[PDB]
Amino acid sequence: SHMGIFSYKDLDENASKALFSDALAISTYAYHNIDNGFDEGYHQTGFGLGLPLTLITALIGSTQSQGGLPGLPWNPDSEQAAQEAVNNAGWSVISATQLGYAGKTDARGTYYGETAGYTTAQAEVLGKYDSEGNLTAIGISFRGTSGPRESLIGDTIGDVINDLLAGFGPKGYADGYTLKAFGNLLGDVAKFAQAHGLSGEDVVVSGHSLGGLAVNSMAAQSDANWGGFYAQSNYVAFASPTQYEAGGKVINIGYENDPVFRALDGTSLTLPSLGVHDAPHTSATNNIVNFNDHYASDAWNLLPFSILNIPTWLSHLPFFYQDGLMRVLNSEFYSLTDKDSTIIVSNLSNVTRGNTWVEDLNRNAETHSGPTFIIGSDGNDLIKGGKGNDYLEGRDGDDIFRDAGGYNLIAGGKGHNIFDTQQALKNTEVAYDGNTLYLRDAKGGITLADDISTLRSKETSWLIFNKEVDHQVTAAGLKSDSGLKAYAAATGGDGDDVLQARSHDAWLFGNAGNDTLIGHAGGNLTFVGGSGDDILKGVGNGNTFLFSGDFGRDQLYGFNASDKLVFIGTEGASGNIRDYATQQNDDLVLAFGHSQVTLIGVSLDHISTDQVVLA
Ligand SMILES: [Ca+2]
Ligand SMILES: [Ca+2]
Ligand SMILES: [Ca+2]
Ligand SMILES: [Ca+2]
Ligand SMILES: [Ca+2]
Ligand SMILES: [Ca+2]
Ligand SMILES: [Ca+2]
Ligand SMILES: [Ca+2]
């Protein structure tokens, strides 16, 4: 059973999604929009010849963004923007007075580290309230490296000393950070929580980079300190160099090409710490790619990947975490993902998005495996899937998709979207159920694609060896300069349809409703019952029975040794059909949670491996 890439402990899927959303919001808030100008600059001028301009904007912003420097009257107030965002997510700062806290805070309510050597640490304490004003949850967020704009340089230097001691300092240092920085504050928050009827489980703890380290540190101290109040608190760490994994308290989320993420092994410095360190960790999402201008560039990657290579730090910036990971969370394919799913997140500048394909380069990382998910932007994307199984999501904007093989799901989203086969149309079998385009390649790989307006092929002749040809996708067939080409299919509607294959039908599409799909003597037919509970009557040899998503409860007659079952984007993580199977007398039931198919008069030992695809 898939629980989502951000699944946490034994929470149900909706609860862990809500926890993740809260964590990322408060983690982001701790930076007070310090990287607002970098965000604008990067998207406007990029990371290549325009990099000098990007850096200027990072420092002093514009009329539309605020860079690192405070006090420029033509910048917008990015700190107010940051407050609005965290308040919108349901969270508001709790004052030192409410907590009865005697330590240091600033005019924005931020809490400061308590011990000498830790006085540049920053934390935020926030509350979530019900519609009647009662406190229902508490959020604790630790800031990564940096500080308030007004003391940015001095504060950053103290942070850097803390960072260096975590890597090269005494054993125990990382573990000690949060206790030394915020030991007293955390005691007061616990008493305040208790006073309001809350327990440790009502607390979310988050933070990014050095803040992610602080999350792991707090978890590491939580069994013994503060009366054990926070032992069962919810720890969500972003871009942490460290992992605390004893007791399974922390989820460590980050991008594999972020050189800070997992830089330390537990808390230990190792040789990979100064190079590529992609050995998988049990608490971590090990295979999410930040597909940005640096990752995309062969020229940038002539330099060795290392935390000592400053350009590689592009992938670490908080705005990439906020924007990119919320798109993962909100993906149409989220319920199909697991902790270690390969996910490629489009994070290109406006300079490169129009000429660079988002694809799994597998750069500076262990070899990827399993299905690949590629998440587009709300802009116009170019997205390319590989030879294995792919889930491609365009979102808003006019997107163009390519894919090199296997079994695939494509969601074009809003906009005018195009699927580009890169070869002669005659090499692809094409059909349409009225909403979804079905494409089968010469090796039998099948793609389902939603919201595709145009199918693009590449044609040739003795005269012009390359010509792109666009085919408008319509209910009546593909329309191009040559005319209208009908689909070789029978297509039902929302009702309970009876569909009988005609001599040249290659597909039967029941669509919604409980349909009856009847084959023919020549076989070689693909049955797609669609949603609802369908009856599939196989006749002859070489038939394919196809099932995707929530496909209802089907009954399958006439299955034999020459037929094939294809499951794409269905419930369950296993790639072995035996795991789904139960014999009920003479019938074989294959169960996919809320969906299932019963093969009438079939036994499991009569089905060979190559008769089933689980994609
Ligand atoms: Ca700081
Ligand atoms: Ca990896
Ligand atoms: Ca898009
Ligand atoms: Ca593919
Ligand atoms: Ca789109
Ligand atoms: Ca129907
Ligand atoms: Ca149906
Ligand atoms: Ca069905």
XYZ file of C-alpha atoms and ligand atoms in Angstrom:
623
model
C 0.000 0.000 0.000
C 1.329 3.446 -1.005
C 1.191 6.022 1.799
C 2.748 9.068 0.032
C 6.387 10.214 -0.124
C 5.870 12.350 3.006
C 4.163 9.627 5.081
C 5.013 9.918 8.782
C 4.929 7.159 11.440
C 1.455 5.610 11.593
C -0.550 8.676 10.504
C -3.129 8.149 7.763
C -2.340 9.738 4.416
C -4.476 12.875 4.844
C -3.009 13.564 8.299
C 0.622 13.250 7.166
C -0.083 15.558 4.188
C -1.520 18.187 6.558
C 1.458 17.775 8.927
C 3.890 18.226 6.019
C 2.100 21.363 4.838
C 2.292 22.886 8.345
C 5.973 21.947 8.750
C 7.053 23.466 5.447
C 5.105 26.654 6.143
C 6.730 27.251 9.540
C 10.199 26.159 8.340
C 9.976 28.671 5.489
C 8.701 31.442 7.821
C 11.870 31.220 9.967
C 13.863 32.820 7.096
C 11.565 35.877 6.891
C 11.815 35.978 3.070
C 15.585 36.590 3.116
C 15.900 34.910 -0.319
C 13.052 36.879 -1.979
C 15.458 38.859 -4.217
C 17.391 35.688 -5.114
C 14.090 34.048 -6.158
C 13.239 36.976 -8.503
C 16.787 37.272 -9.844
C 17.216 33.557 -10.510
C 13.938 33.329 -12.439
C 14.571 36.544 -14.436
C 18.300 36.289 -15.314
C 19.234 32.667 -14.485
C 22.528 31.048 -13.452
C 24.667 31.434 -16.600
C 25.756 34.566 -18.443
C 23.080 36.382 -16.406
C 24.456 35.237 -13.023
C 26.082 38.596 -12.178
C 22.641 40.241 -12.516
C 21.024 37.495 -10.436
C 23.546 38.142 -7.661
C 22.829 41.905 -7.671
C 19.129 41.248 -7.336
C 19.838 38.751 -4.520
C 21.526 41.561 -2.566
C 19.334 44.633 -3.220
C 16.111 43.329 -4.827
C 13.977 45.504 -7.107
C 10.587 47.248 -7.039
C 9.083 43.715 -6.933
C 11.311 41.872 -4.431
C 13.559 42.505 -1.393
C 17.148 41.189 -1.353
C 19.389 40.661 1.686
C 19.844 44.382 2.449
C 17.191 46.111 4.602
C 16.072 49.739 4.424
C 15.701 50.445 0.685
C 12.443 52.423 0.286
C 11.733 51.077 -3.242
C 11.826 47.409 -2.173
C 8.480 45.927 -1.150
C 8.092 44.783 2.493
C 8.972 41.101 2.102
C 8.826 40.511 5.863
C 5.131 41.446 5.908
C 4.629 39.062 2.963
C 6.274 36.267 5.008
C 3.978 36.950 7.975
C 0.894 36.863 5.731
C 1.926 33.495 4.311
C 2.445 31.824 7.695
C -0.775 33.371 9.088
C -2.643 32.091 6.000
C -1.337 28.594 6.725
C -3.061 28.908 10.132
C -0.108 29.887 12.340
C 0.544 32.978 14.491
C 3.505 33.905 16.726
C 3.225 33.314 20.487
C 4.764 36.102 22.588
C 7.403 35.751 25.308
C 4.811 37.200 27.699
C 2.323 34.403 26.969
C 5.101 31.856 27.534
C 6.496 33.636 30.588
C 9.899 33.477 28.854
C 12.748 35.546 30.356
C 15.194 35.241 27.431
C 15.860 37.376 24.355
C 13.345 38.143 21.589
C 13.332 40.775 18.830
C 10.649 43.188 17.609
C 9.313 40.510 15.242
C 8.881 38.014 18.093
C 11.797 35.770 17.115
C 13.570 33.884 19.958
C 17.389 33.905 20.270
C 19.878 31.249 21.450
C 20.559 31.201 25.193
C 24.153 29.946 25.662
C 27.437 31.653 24.727
C 28.486 30.234 21.355
C 24.824 29.797 20.402
C 23.506 33.357 20.570
C 22.940 33.616 16.794
C 20.512 30.675 16.796
C 16.883 31.687 15.982
C 13.571 29.977 16.694
C 9.910 30.786 16.128
C 7.087 29.563 18.383
C 3.612 29.609 16.804
C 0.056 28.528 17.607
C -2.913 27.242 15.612
C -6.424 28.087 16.888
C -9.936 26.727 16.359
C -12.881 28.862 15.215
C -13.563 29.703 18.868
C -10.045 30.903 19.730
C -8.890 27.776 21.558
C -5.281 26.676 21.016
C -5.178 23.354 19.161
C -1.519 22.986 18.138
C 1.931 24.488 18.607
C 4.647 24.908 15.976
C 8.351 25.212 16.719
C 10.621 26.268 13.872
C 14.392 26.603 13.857
C 16.145 28.994 11.440
C 18.959 27.747 9.171
C 22.149 29.711 8.547
C 21.452 33.500 8.411
C 19.642 35.980 10.672
C 17.576 39.173 10.688
C 18.439 41.505 7.780
C 19.594 44.186 10.246
C 22.435 42.040 11.650
C 22.805 39.630 8.759
C 26.618 39.403 8.474
C 27.551 39.121 12.168
C 24.705 36.692 12.750
C 25.656 34.491 9.774
C 29.277 34.269 11.001
C 28.139 32.833 14.370
C 25.902 30.384 12.487
C 28.870 29.297 10.346
C 30.964 28.573 13.446
C 28.108 26.334 14.684
C 27.962 24.613 11.247
C 31.729 23.960 11.212
C 31.726 22.541 14.745
C 28.927 20.125 13.782
C 31.148 18.722 11.021
C 34.650 19.055 12.428
C 34.055 19.619 16.136
C 33.792 17.353 19.168
C 31.607 14.268 19.157
C 28.159 15.130 20.503
C 28.129 18.702 19.160
C 25.244 18.393 16.688
C 23.244 16.459 19.285
C 23.813 19.267 21.799
C 22.861 22.263 19.621
C 19.148 22.590 20.467
C 19.612 21.889 24.181
C 22.275 24.597 24.456
C 20.454 27.094 22.216
C 16.864 26.672 23.430
C 16.775 24.382 26.471
C 15.008 26.926 28.699
C 12.565 28.087 26.010
C 11.519 24.505 25.247
C 10.751 23.948 28.947
C 8.494 27.007 29.024
C 6.707 25.983 25.802
C 6.017 22.545 27.333
C 4.450 24.082 30.457
C 2.411 26.458 28.292
C 1.264 23.532 26.140
C 0.266 21.582 29.247
C -1.609 24.580 30.638
C -3.752 24.548 27.486
C -4.498 20.798 27.555
C -2.035 19.833 24.799
C 0.429 16.919 24.719
C 3.656 16.326 22.777
C 1.681 14.883 19.856
C 0.057 18.319 19.353
C 3.446 19.855 18.504
C 5.031 20.114 15.067
C 8.798 20.784 14.976
C 10.487 21.891 11.738
C 13.374 23.854 10.154
C 15.772 23.893 7.193
C 19.574 23.341 6.939
C 21.122 24.220 10.318
C 17.443 24.422 11.352
C 16.975 20.815 10.118
C 19.990 19.812 12.229
C 18.250 21.492 15.195
C 15.133 19.407 14.520
C 17.178 16.186 14.644
C 19.014 17.475 17.751
C 15.743 18.155 19.612
C 14.483 14.683 18.715
C 17.763 13.176 19.951
C 17.267 14.892 23.354
C 13.497 14.410 23.679
C 13.359 11.075 25.560
C 15.486 12.341 28.448
C 14.881 16.114 28.593
C 11.838 18.324 29.323
C 10.135 15.542 31.320
C 9.901 13.574 28.079
C 7.121 15.932 27.005
C 8.292 16.040 23.365
C 9.166 12.318 22.975
C 6.136 11.791 20.704
C 6.208 15.178 18.970
C 6.137 15.448 15.143
C 9.653 16.056 13.757
C 9.858 17.116 10.084
C 13.379 18.239 9.052
C 14.294 19.894 5.743
C 17.784 19.797 4.159
C 19.453 18.555 7.370
C 23.101 17.455 7.198
C 22.382 15.050 10.110
C 19.926 12.239 10.944
C 18.639 11.028 14.302
C 17.034 7.672 13.580
C 16.812 5.819 16.928
C 13.101 5.503 17.808
C 11.950 6.628 14.349
C 11.044 10.189 15.414
C 12.197 12.219 12.398
C 11.402 12.375 8.693
C 14.319 13.938 6.798
C 13.140 15.610 3.566
C 15.404 17.145 0.925
C 16.758 17.113 -2.608
C 19.453 14.571 -3.540
C 21.428 17.260 -5.434
C 21.443 19.592 -2.388
C 25.047 19.148 -1.129
C 24.059 19.974 2.490
C 21.331 17.320 2.655
C 22.668 14.160 4.376
C 26.248 15.553 4.305
C 26.896 13.747 7.619
C 26.379 10.005 8.221
C 24.183 10.072 11.311
C 26.319 12.814 12.842
C 29.682 11.523 11.554
C 32.032 13.162 9.067
C 32.968 10.669 6.324
C 34.840 10.858 3.006
C 31.555 11.260 1.017
C 30.817 14.333 3.204
C 33.068 16.384 0.919
C 31.751 14.887 -2.347
C 28.633 13.000 -3.455
C 26.812 11.436 -0.477
C 23.693 9.680 -1.825
C 23.838 6.437 0.212
C 20.195 5.982 1.234
C 19.140 6.725 4.840
C 16.187 5.051 6.507
C 14.636 8.363 7.743
C 15.183 10.245 4.445
C 13.499 10.890 1.091
C 16.555 9.762 -0.888
C 15.570 10.400 -4.521
C 13.975 13.839 -5.109
C 15.789 15.960 -7.741
C 15.831 19.772 -7.762
C 15.843 20.209 -11.570
C 17.301 23.719 -11.765
C 19.659 25.596 -14.112
C 22.756 24.176 -12.336
C 21.607 20.536 -12.427
C 20.630 20.892 -16.092
C 23.999 22.324 -17.197
C 26.764 20.008 -18.444
C 29.174 22.979 -18.237
C 28.490 23.694 -14.549
C 28.937 20.016 -13.766
C 32.467 19.853 -15.179
C 33.264 20.925 -11.621
C 33.089 18.107 -9.019
C 29.924 18.020 -6.917
C 30.826 19.063 -3.359
C 29.600 21.132 -0.402
C 32.903 23.008 -0.939
C 31.769 23.953 -4.479
C 29.694 27.083 -3.807
C 27.672 27.084 -7.074
C 26.162 23.686 -6.050
C 24.465 25.440 -3.117
C 21.877 26.822 -5.574
C 19.861 23.626 -4.944
C 19.747 24.307 -1.156
C 17.842 27.657 -1.216
C 14.607 27.755 0.896
C 12.415 29.077 -1.930
C 13.131 25.912 -3.973
C 12.031 23.844 -0.962
C 8.810 25.812 -0.421
C 7.698 26.042 -4.062
C 8.961 22.669 -5.351
C 7.888 20.459 -2.460
C 4.378 21.961 -2.289
C 4.001 20.967 -5.976
C 5.005 17.402 -5.013
C 2.479 17.449 -2.160
C -0.287 18.790 -4.420
C 0.501 16.438 -7.345
C -2.304 14.502 -9.029
C 0.004 11.483 -8.570
C 0.824 11.964 -4.863
C -1.150 8.904 -3.678
C 1.087 6.692 -5.874
C 4.381 7.860 -4.257
C 6.586 6.270 -1.544
C 9.427 7.681 0.649
C 12.081 6.681 -1.880
C 10.185 7.350 -5.151
C 12.260 9.003 -7.880
C 10.773 12.499 -8.273
C 12.121 15.129 -10.691
C 10.871 18.635 -9.787
C 11.019 21.368 -12.452
C 12.762 24.425 -10.983
C 14.170 26.140 -14.103
C 14.601 29.878 -14.697
C 12.600 31.754 -17.358
C 15.853 31.808 -19.330
C 16.033 28.019 -19.733
C 12.493 26.683 -19.308
C 11.739 27.188 -23.019
C 14.760 25.276 -24.330
C 15.660 22.674 -21.687
C 13.949 19.289 -21.254
C 13.108 18.269 -17.657
C 14.298 14.659 -17.452
C 16.025 12.169 -15.164
C 19.721 12.810 -15.876
C 20.598 10.813 -12.736
C 23.511 13.228 -12.252
C 25.702 12.931 -9.127
C 23.479 10.254 -7.548
C 23.069 6.476 -7.123
C 21.302 4.782 -10.042
C 17.539 5.428 -9.777
C 14.992 2.568 -9.843
C 11.205 2.085 -9.799
C 8.697 4.398 -11.480
C 9.711 8.011 -12.155
C 7.495 11.016 -11.380
C 8.217 14.325 -13.155
C 6.482 17.432 -11.784
C 6.079 20.472 -14.040
C 5.564 24.156 -13.211
C 2.612 26.441 -13.767
C 4.605 27.762 -16.750
C 5.211 26.305 -20.223
C 7.296 23.167 -19.677
C 9.224 20.665 -21.790
C 9.014 17.266 -20.014
C 10.725 14.028 -21.129
C 10.146 10.576 -19.603
C 12.641 7.710 -19.985
C 12.515 4.104 -21.233
C 11.000 2.848 -17.972
C 7.640 3.662 -16.363
C 6.855 7.369 -15.961
C 4.209 9.627 -14.410
C 4.414 13.075 -16.040
C 2.520 16.108 -14.681
C 2.310 19.356 -16.681
C 0.135 21.525 -14.393
C -0.895 24.935 -15.796
C 0.654 26.368 -18.974
C 1.182 24.990 -22.477
C 3.315 21.905 -21.918
C 5.054 19.515 -24.353
C 5.753 15.898 -23.414
C 8.131 13.262 -24.767
C 8.691 9.694 -23.504
C 11.193 7.016 -24.525
C 9.201 3.861 -23.645
C 7.535 1.622 -21.071
C 4.145 2.167 -19.422
C 3.221 5.756 -18.610
C 0.565 8.177 -17.280
C 0.531 11.782 -18.505
C -1.596 14.611 -17.077
C -1.397 17.671 -19.322
C -3.389 19.873 -16.907
C -4.819 23.206 -18.045
C -3.477 24.843 -21.207
C -2.770 23.746 -24.755
C -0.684 20.572 -24.273
C 1.215 18.490 -26.853
C 2.514 14.912 -26.909
C 5.528 14.518 -29.238
C 6.266 10.953 -30.430
C 9.539 11.969 -32.165
C 8.898 9.475 -34.977
C 6.571 8.459 -37.831
C 2.929 8.204 -36.740
C 2.641 4.778 -38.411
C 4.960 3.423 -35.660
C 2.469 4.176 -32.876
C -1.011 2.755 -32.344
C -3.288 5.636 -31.392
C -6.809 5.642 -29.888
C -8.983 8.010 -27.791
C -11.817 7.378 -25.305
C -13.159 10.942 -25.619
C -10.931 12.350 -22.862
C -7.803 10.170 -22.634
C -5.374 9.454 -25.460
C -4.015 5.864 -25.601
C -0.660 5.232 -27.325
C 1.017 1.830 -27.814
C 4.607 1.592 -29.082
C 6.266 -1.115 -31.185
C 7.388 -2.978 -28.030
C 3.900 -3.031 -26.478
C 4.460 -0.178 -23.988
C 1.232 1.753 -23.330
C 0.780 5.437 -22.446
C -2.436 7.086 -21.205
C -2.485 10.887 -21.595
C -5.120 13.364 -20.384
C -5.716 16.909 -21.714
C -3.636 16.501 -24.876
C -4.857 18.770 -27.688
C -2.204 17.966 -30.260
C -0.324 14.782 -31.144
C 2.968 15.647 -32.847
C 4.896 13.191 -35.058
C 8.078 13.399 -37.116
C 7.635 12.297 -40.707
C 10.083 11.847 -43.534
C 10.468 11.247 -47.209
C 13.061 10.787 -49.898
C 13.160 14.595 -50.067
C 12.767 16.044 -46.551
C 14.330 13.783 -43.945
C 12.567 15.620 -41.112
C 9.217 17.346 -40.767
C 7.137 17.896 -37.628
C 3.486 17.145 -38.270
C 0.744 18.196 -35.859
C -2.484 16.212 -35.511
C -5.440 17.827 -33.687
C -6.979 15.366 -31.205
C -10.753 15.296 -31.706
C -13.689 13.087 -30.768
C -13.931 11.920 -34.401
C -10.221 11.167 -34.904
C -6.882 12.885 -35.570
C -7.142 15.893 -37.860
C -4.219 17.167 -39.903
C -3.436 18.675 -43.294
C -4.120 15.221 -44.796
C -7.689 14.924 -43.469
C -9.457 13.104 -40.634
C -8.210 9.707 -39.443
C -10.744 7.833 -37.305
C -9.647 5.806 -34.276
C -9.856 2.018 -34.603
C -12.072 1.733 -31.559
C -15.601 1.417 -30.218
C -16.344 4.021 -27.563
C -19.166 4.109 -25.026
C -20.354 6.927 -22.769
C -21.408 7.586 -19.171
C -24.110 4.916 -19.368
C -24.178 1.140 -19.163
C -23.053 0.307 -22.688
C -22.896 -2.914 -24.653
C -19.906 -2.714 -26.990
C -19.291 -5.360 -29.634
C -15.972 -5.210 -31.474
C -16.129 -4.695 -35.232
C -13.668 -6.379 -37.609
C -10.974 -3.682 -37.345
C -11.546 -2.433 -33.803
C -8.276 -2.604 -31.829
C -9.769 -1.044 -28.669
C -13.040 -1.097 -26.706
C -13.652 1.804 -24.287
C -16.585 1.414 -21.910
C -15.903 4.676 -20.110
C -18.038 5.399 -17.013
C -20.851 3.030 -16.056
C -21.134 -0.737 -15.911
C -20.372 -1.826 -19.447
C -20.287 -5.107 -21.340
C -17.309 -5.408 -23.720
C -17.562 -8.262 -26.225
C -14.540 -9.458 -28.246
C -14.246 -11.074 -31.683
C -12.856 -14.262 -33.258
C -9.715 -12.567 -34.596
C -8.604 -11.607 -31.070
C -5.814 -9.005 -30.777
C -8.184 -6.668 -28.975
C -7.556 -4.297 -26.072
C -10.349 -4.144 -23.454
C -10.678 -0.970 -21.371
C -13.754 -1.153 -19.106
C -12.919 2.177 -17.489
C -14.505 3.301 -14.253
C -17.469 1.262 -13.003
C -18.029 -2.485 -12.814
C -17.488 -3.958 -16.285
C -17.915 -7.359 -17.922
C -15.051 -8.275 -20.271
C -15.707 -11.127 -22.720
C -12.390 -12.285 -24.193
C -12.554 -14.127 -27.539
C -9.658 -15.668 -29.505
C -5.967 -14.997 -28.843
C -3.604 -12.097 -28.166
C -6.060 -9.907 -26.246
C -4.928 -7.240 -23.751
C -7.025 -6.331 -20.700
C -6.111 -2.832 -19.466
C -6.745 -1.231 -16.051
C -5.672 2.163 -14.643
C -6.326 4.164 -11.461
C -9.594 3.428 -9.681
C -11.018 0.925 -12.187
C -13.943 -0.553 -10.191
C -14.837 -4.240 -9.955
C -14.566 -6.089 -13.289
C -15.298 -9.692 -14.324
C -13.038 -11.179 -17.030
C -14.186 -14.131 -19.186
C -12.200 -16.205 -21.675
C -8.633 -15.503 -20.468
C -5.960 -17.814 -21.903
C -2.174 -18.342 -22.161
C -1.932 -15.876 -25.089
C -3.662 -12.957 -23.336
C -2.167 -10.123 -21.274
C -3.146 -8.065 -18.185
C -1.816 -4.500 -17.881
C -2.148 -2.446 -14.681
C -0.955 1.189 -14.699
C -1.027 3.548 -11.693
C -3.136 1.169 -9.557
C -3.346 0.616 -5.759
C -0.518 -1.455 -4.223
C 3.294 -1.262 -4.265
C 4.151 -4.858 -5.196
C 5.430 -5.830 -8.641
C 4.485 -9.510 -8.130
C 0.888 -10.306 -9.151
C 0.874 -13.275 -6.753
C 0.715 -10.701 -3.946
C -2.725 -9.545 -5.177
C -4.167 -12.981 -5.909
C -6.644 -15.266 -4.133
C -8.257 -18.380 -5.584
C -12.008 -18.606 -5.001
C -12.982 -22.015 -6.299
C -12.587 -21.938 -10.088
C -12.149 -18.143 -10.143
C -9.003 -16.077 -9.612
C -9.493 -12.772 -7.797
C -6.906 -10.002 -8.247
C -7.629 -7.330 -5.639
C -6.440 -3.729 -5.788
C -8.088 -2.214 -2.699
C -11.225 -0.425 -3.910
C -10.769 -1.982 -7.361
C -10.475 -5.601 -8.495
C -10.777 -8.012 -11.412
C -12.078 -11.592 -11.244
C -10.743 -14.000 -13.885
C -13.482 -16.574 -14.367
C -12.335 -20.199 -14.755
C -8.640 -19.390 -14.311
C -6.076 -20.681 -11.798
C -2.956 -18.790 -10.694
C -0.429 -21.475 -11.686
C -1.504 -21.069 -15.334
C -0.398 -17.433 -15.620
C 3.185 -16.774 -16.742
C 5.274 -13.733 -15.759
C 5.152 -12.131 -19.216
C 1.325 -12.175 -19.156
C 1.170 -9.460 -16.506
C 2.468 -5.899 -16.336
C 2.365 -3.988 -13.048
C 3.426 -0.405 -13.765
Ca 21.228 32.729 12.850
Ca 19.331 9.151 -4.390
Ca 3.284 23.512 -16.990
Ca 8.593 6.075 -19.993
Ca -0.522 22.177 -18.985
Ca -20.167 3.374 -20.354
Ca -17.117 1.229 -17.383
Ca -14.049 -1.076 -14.622
